[PDB]
Amino acid sequence: GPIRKVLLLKEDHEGLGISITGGKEHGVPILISEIHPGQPADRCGGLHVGDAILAVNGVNLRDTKHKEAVTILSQQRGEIEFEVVYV
């Protein structure tokens, strides 16, 4: 599908509210496998199961290993930009 830019607002006591799978070592992108109800990703409205996360706050995640992506994603705070695509 089309590449999208999506804004997510997170408070400091929360996680992103997603589960991710995949990663470079598996030959696939960082993929959203869950959107947890009522948590920031669900609330932002623009992130969905099956979306590949291409970048977060300008950090490219297309060639990142699974745990690298976890560290990068969990570091982001507040108003967080995502670049995503559903394939």
Partner: peptide, 10 residues
């Protein structure tokens, strides 16, 4: 389902 890739809750 298959669980060959890791999943992380974040």
């Amino acid at each position: 389902a298959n669980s060959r890739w890791p999943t992380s809750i974040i």
